[PDB]
């Protein structure tokens, strides 16, 4: 008995503090196969979670950094048989309280081949100009 | 047979899409899928389900929609869904009406192919003012 927004609070929830704390743990969210176009710290696109992980590895420091606020968040589901969800969010991303840029991220989620969780297949970000 | 890149798929369509709506609005609905989800800009949002209704939403806004100008800044895309046939375009960029101001904005797409591949019919649709 779960509804949508449920699914998104926690995952975002979840997937944004991640990624104040640690962001060495942030590809334990993602499918094995998922897809990542995220914007350097020009954008970078890379496959699987492997090299998701050494993406944020990589920029550890600096993703830790940029503290991501949320100003709109939208979700519906999609995908096979209706059981993915498609997530917009938009904001502002703030280094040490001053505005860099703002950000708009589409996340796609994938129910588990068990149960209950979700993996991200899909993470499209954009740092775009103030 | 191919040699076609996600690149042109998603470049035509977006081309497509955005010169029905200066040229038909009425006509817009019939790139969406019978039971394709709408999120878009109240003429705050408004949500709308199946190709019935996406058609209203497009009809009754017609004269707004039509004149409207669009220039895309961003235009990020990924393959998604099942057997990773779908496709997921993000884009940014600013709107703006004959007479006043301009609003950056931010829409998602996802595309699913038709049942005998004829077209990418769209499957999601969600559009934010930023």
Redesign the interface.
Known sequence: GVTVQDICFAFLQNYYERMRTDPSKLAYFYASTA?L?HTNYP?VKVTGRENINKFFSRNDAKVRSLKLKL??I?F?????L?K?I?I?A?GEMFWTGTPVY?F?Q?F?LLPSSNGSTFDI??D?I?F?SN
Request: aromatic residues 4%; proline residues 0%.
């Open positions: 897809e176009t954008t100003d709109t939208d519906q589901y999609t995908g096979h209706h993915s498609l917009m938009t703002k708009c589409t796609i297949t899909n499209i954009r775009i």
